[PDB]
């Protein structure tokens, strides 16, 4: 579906990716990176995550129909990293 | 217009 980028990401000492997140189901809009902060792992990243990037997968798992909150606590979810790095499949817009 | 800061 579209032209997809696939982006993997280690968290900073804060465990922070240096992104921000709008929109998901209850915000009836979809997952956008809204700003990337100068030198966290978001902006060195190679590919790089951009700001108006739809997120589409989230360590695979769709999150279409999902809300704000459970978009956040999906990026949290460390766990959920292989291997330690955040997966991200996204749509540049 | 929810934003947060990851």
């Given at each position: 579906?579209?032209?997809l980028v696939?982006?993997?990401?280690?968290?900073?000492?804060?465990?922070?990716f240096?992104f921000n997140?709008?929109?998901?189901?209850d915000?009836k809009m979809?997952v956008?990176?809204?700003?990337?902060?100068?030198?966290?792992?978001?902006?060195?990243?190679?590919?790089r995550?951009?700001?108006?990037?739809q997120?589409?997968?989230?360590?695979?798992?769709?999150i279409?129909?999902?809300?704000?909150?459970?978009?956040?606590?999906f990026?949290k979810?460390?766990?959920?990293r292989?291997?330690?790095?955040?997966?991200?499949?996204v749509?540049?817009? | 217009?929810?934003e947060?800061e990851?």
């Open positions: 579906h579209d032209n696939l982006i993997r990401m280690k968290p900073d000492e804060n465990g922070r240096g997140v709008k929109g998901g189901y915000q979809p956008i990176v809204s700003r990337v902060a100068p030198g966290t792992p978001a902006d060195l990243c190679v590919p995550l951009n700001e108006g990037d997120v589409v997968l989230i360590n695979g798992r769709d279409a129909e999902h809300t704000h909150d459970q978009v956040v606590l990026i979810a460390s766990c959920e292989h291997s330690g790095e955040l997966m991200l499949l749509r540049p817009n | 217009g929810r947060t990851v």
